[PDB]
Amino acid sequence: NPDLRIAQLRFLLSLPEHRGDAAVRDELMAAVRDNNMAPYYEALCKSLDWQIDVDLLNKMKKANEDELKRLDEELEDAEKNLGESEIRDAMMAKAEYLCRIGDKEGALTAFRKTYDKTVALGHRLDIVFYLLRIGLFYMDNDLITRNTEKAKSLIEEGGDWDRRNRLKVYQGLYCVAIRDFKQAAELFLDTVSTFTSYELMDYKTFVTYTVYVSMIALERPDLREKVIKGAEILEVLHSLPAVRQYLFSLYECRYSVFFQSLAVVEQEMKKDWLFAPHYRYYVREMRIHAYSQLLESYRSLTLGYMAEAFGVGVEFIDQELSRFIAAGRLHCKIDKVNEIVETNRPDSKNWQYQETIKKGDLLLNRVQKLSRVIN
Amino acid sequence: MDDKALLVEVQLLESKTYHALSNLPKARAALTSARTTANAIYCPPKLQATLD
Amino acid sequence: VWEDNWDDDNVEDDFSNQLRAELEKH
Amino acid sequence: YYTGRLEYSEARRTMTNALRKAPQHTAVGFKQTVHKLLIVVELLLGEIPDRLQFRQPSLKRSLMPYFLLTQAVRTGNLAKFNQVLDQFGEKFQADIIRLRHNVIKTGVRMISLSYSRISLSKEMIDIYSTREPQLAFHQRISFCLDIHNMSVKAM
Amino acid sequence: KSQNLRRLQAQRNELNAKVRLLREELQLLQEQGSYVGEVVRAMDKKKVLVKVHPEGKFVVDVDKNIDINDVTPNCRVALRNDSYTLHKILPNKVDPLVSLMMVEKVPDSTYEMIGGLDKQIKEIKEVIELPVKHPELFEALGIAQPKGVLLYGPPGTGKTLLARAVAHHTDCTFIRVSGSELVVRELFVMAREHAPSIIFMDEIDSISGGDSEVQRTMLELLNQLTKNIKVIMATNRIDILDSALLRPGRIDRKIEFPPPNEEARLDILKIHSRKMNLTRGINLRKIAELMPGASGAEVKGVCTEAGMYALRERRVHVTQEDFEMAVAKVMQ
Amino acid sequence: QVIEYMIV
Numbered sequence A: 001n002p003d004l005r006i007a008q009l010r011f012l013l014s015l016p017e018h019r020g021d022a023a024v025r026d027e028l029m030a031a032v033r034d035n036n037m038a039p040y041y042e043a044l045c046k047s048l049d050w051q052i053d054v055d056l057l058n059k060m061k062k063a064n065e066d067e068l069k070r071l072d073e074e075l076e077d078a079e080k081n082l083g084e085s086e087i088r089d090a091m092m093a094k095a096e097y098l099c100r101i102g103d104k105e106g107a108l109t110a111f112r113k114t115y116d117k118t119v120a121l122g123h124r125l126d127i128v129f130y131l132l133r134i135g136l137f138y139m140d141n142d143l144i145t146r147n148t149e150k151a152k153s154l155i156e157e158g159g160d161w162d163r164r165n166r167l168k169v170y171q172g173l174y175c176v177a178i179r180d181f182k183q184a185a186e187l188f189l190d191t192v193s194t195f196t197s198y199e200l201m202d203y204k205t206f207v208t209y210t211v212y213v214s215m216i217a218l219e220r221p222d223l224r225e226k227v228i229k230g231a232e233i234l235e236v237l238h239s240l241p242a243v244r245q246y247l248f249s250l251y252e253c254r255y256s257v258f259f260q261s262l263a264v265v266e267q268e269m270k271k272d273w274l275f276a277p278h279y280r281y282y283v284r285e286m287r288i289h290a291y292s293q294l295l296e297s298y299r300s301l302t303l304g305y306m307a308e309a310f311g312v313g314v315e316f317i318d319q320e321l322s323r324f325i326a327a328g329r330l331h332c333k334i335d336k337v338n339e340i341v342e343t344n345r346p347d348s349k350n351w352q353y354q355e356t357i358k359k360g361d362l363l364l365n366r367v368q369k370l371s372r373v374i375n
Numbered sequence B: 001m002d003d004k005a006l007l008v009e010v011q012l013l014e015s016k017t018y019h020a021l022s023n024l025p026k027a028r029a030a031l032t033s034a035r036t037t038a039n040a041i042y043c044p045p046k047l048q049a050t051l052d
Numbered sequence C: 001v002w003e004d005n006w007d008d009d010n011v012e013d014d015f016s017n018q019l020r021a022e023l024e025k026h
Numbered sequence D: 001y002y003t004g005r006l007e008y009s010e011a012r013r014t015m016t017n018a019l020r021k022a023p024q025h026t027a028v029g030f031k032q033t034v035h036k037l038l039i040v041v042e043l044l045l046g047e048i049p050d051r052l053q054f055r056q057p058s059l060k061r062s063l064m065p066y067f068l069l070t071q072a073v074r075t076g077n078l079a080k081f082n083q084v085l086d087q088f089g090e091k092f093q094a095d096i097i098r099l100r101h102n103v104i105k106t107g108v109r110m111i112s113l114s115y116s117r118i119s120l121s122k123e124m125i126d127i128y129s130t131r132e133p134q135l136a137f138h139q140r141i142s143f144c145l146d147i148h149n150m151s152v153k154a155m
Numbered sequence E: 001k002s003q004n005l006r007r008l009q010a011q012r013n014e015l016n017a018k019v020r021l022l023r024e025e026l027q028l029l030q031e032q033g034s035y036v037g038e039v040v041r042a043m044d045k046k047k048v049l050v051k052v053h054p055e056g057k058f059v060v061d062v063d064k065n066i067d068i069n070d071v072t073p074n075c076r077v078a079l080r081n082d083s084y085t086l087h088k089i090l091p092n093k094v095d096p097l098v099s100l101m102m103v104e105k106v107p108d109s110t111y112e113m114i115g116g117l118d119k120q121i122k123e124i125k126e127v128i129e130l131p132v133k134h135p136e137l138f139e140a141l142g143i144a145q146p147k148g149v150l151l152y153g154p155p156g157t158g159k160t161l162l163a164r165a166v167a168h169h170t171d172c173t174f175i176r177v178s179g180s181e182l183v184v185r186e187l188f189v190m191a192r193e194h195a196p197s198i199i200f201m202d203e204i205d206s207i208s209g210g211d212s213e214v215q216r217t218m219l220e221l222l223n224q225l226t227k228n229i230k231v232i233m234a235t236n237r238i239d240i241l242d243s244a245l246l247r248p249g250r251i252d253r254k255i256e257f258p259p260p261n262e263e264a265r266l267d268i269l270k271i272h273s274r275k276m277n278l279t280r281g282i283n284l285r286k287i288a289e290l291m292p293g294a295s296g297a298e299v300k301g302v303c304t305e306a307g308m309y310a311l312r313e314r315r316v317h318v319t320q321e322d323f324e325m326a327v328a329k330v331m332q
Numbered sequence F: 001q002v003i004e005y006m007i008v
């Protein structure tokens, strides 16, 4: 099932000297030494990594022509007494095998080839999962979205809601990579997760991904109780105490350990390949949601009690909160006249206005990009 | 013997013993199991309503 | 991505600012 | 665009009129400096983060200095805008108070400690409104649709 | 100015054409309404032999722009507005079998979701698409023709669904003559027209000469017989039927359906459990634990009843125990 | 805005 943790390894190796060689190097070449697969694993090492030596590469290409050569005579064998289920499965030799080649033609032009001569929807969304899931490995967003609108074609009897949840996990795992943190948590949250022994779910990851994707967009009063007093996730983060003490350090206001808990997440931001403005934006919105949670209950916030939030003192809160009100996303202001921060709340009536100036402009601009002669 | 001839009632009673102190190793399992074996007999409303 | 981030100027993040924060206090 | 090559009131409407005709035109000269120069002038009026950095990967046309000065104003201090200016020095387009203007949009609070600190009729503060304040922006899109009629006069 | 003026001419002429056919539209609708009807097709100079809807016959003409050459029988379209002469063609309007397929809508599309039968599908695909899509090795192997398959098994478990599925992987057709309610020998013509076809039967003894009569009645025409039609008979027991069918080989294939064992019932209960939501983990084996004599249906029934037993508590996830009170309910 | 307030 291309491609597994080798996606994360392919990230971690090409990640800079934050992480290079030395024992992410062997587990990568445990697959490269395994699966005998030339057409990506030379394009893998091309990226500032490794060159010829050809030492693995010869019997790698040789077993590639062994399996690739022997699969062809089932495509030419499946006419004696072998129907379209067997030309089908011969194209599954070419399809699973030429999908773990990791080529975007060897898999991609085989799947539309097996989209012809095709039995019903034990296939039509079996492959469009299996095409979507390697599209995650190659992050080609057009392939993902076209597999969504090809994958909303489940009206079989398709009200197969242990296969909607496979697609719902795929939507959550993709929409966390395209900033849509609203769609990610609930989809994840209301899923439970199970996909052929959770092999793409790769759990020891999933419920964690939920409980540190939630507090971006899942609203702090509403379903955060459904996070906390929801008896489906609390017992499986019981074995995961780090994200647990990341979770109950917001609603319990013990923030001298919460910034500690968020500094952990900024060290396990390194792992996931949906990476860079996701963790910088993520720490930004954990940070801003943490400060806005504190000062909203008070009409006046003193310097000593805001210093009590960790123990950072003054200038951390001063420069940082001045950057936040420079962004204007809280309502506070660094009233150093007394060193007591004031907070009323102008509501979200203005939120819209400010939102829609930019929004409106962008929308018209798109049309302004089109509605000239170029049509 | 024949399944749950009276162990619907005994299983109800030991299901009453846990909730004095205990947790989920009974809570849903033995009670719902008593209900699964409680839709296959002539039920009086004493035993069936006590199971309700 | 494709929702405009800052990612500009700022020195090493809440891990290191956490580190010199608690170290500078203590 | 050549008319775009002082005033800042209409450099962005001539930026919309400018950034039209280049499917694949040149690699130096005509295609290159129109985009990056005009968005630099779009920071000479003072327009900051959210059209800048994710709009960069279309061109990527040698892409160092002008973007560096855009975040050098997006932060807004003279200390590292110095080394944007003097250490580069060849960036050209020679033709300071604007990155001063950014940080003092905040204030400490408002007055700033009896009219004195440094950082380095609608009683509301300017949120929104239901009168003259938001009306101006409103009649923006209406005007746009009216100007977009031109579409009906083309077949 | 003249070019723009001719653009204004295009606008004015367009609106003037709109008012043309609106004005002669309001005088136009004072004319007649064409009839409609199926036919038995023409023979001669013009010709039709129609049968119009209320009273079913006439012989009418055809207009110059109709090209009487393609208008084939049982393809209803007419226009003999008043004098009785054709104009054009309309939506074919679903021929005969389209009727007894959509009507007896009994046959439910099925494909490959058969719950753990592989010897059975190997043997039926051995004798239902090899004699259709590869006849070449039968006319060189010395085999005459395989035709006619008897599906004997318990009520449930393989009927109306295996013969459905391998009828439509092959895209053959699936004619069912189960029952004779509303309308033998005429069905053969339809099957012949379809070119390739599959005829299916009925199995009633309990859930004198019922349908073995028609069975042979079409094996008499089928034996000497425009060749890729394959009758299928499902019965509950092989011993209950006629001694005339006991004539090897009259039934070139006697496929056997057993009641499902442990793992095949975790396969069918795996699929019907793949119809709905469950939870983070089921481990479906304990339900299959008491599978003992089960039936195909006996699995779809308990999975729907487990869904309803999750529905009774207004709950949106089918837990473990709703299966246990489903299969512990249905033991009746 | 009564002067200011093309659509037809």
Ligand SMILES: Nc1ncnc2c1ncn2[C@@H]1O[C@H](COP(=O)(O)OP(=O)(O)O)[C@@H](O)[C@H]1O
Residues within 6 Å of the ligand: E113, E114, E115, E116, E117, E154, E155, E156, E157, E158, E159, E160, E161, E234, E268, E295, E296, E297, E300
């Ligand atoms: N192996 C199986 N796979 C899928 N469905 C089955 C299986 N066995 C029985 N069924 C169920 O039986 C129903 C089809 O009825 P059928 O088996 O044709 O009746 P009969 O048992 O009288 O032949 C379907 O709803 C189907 O779910």
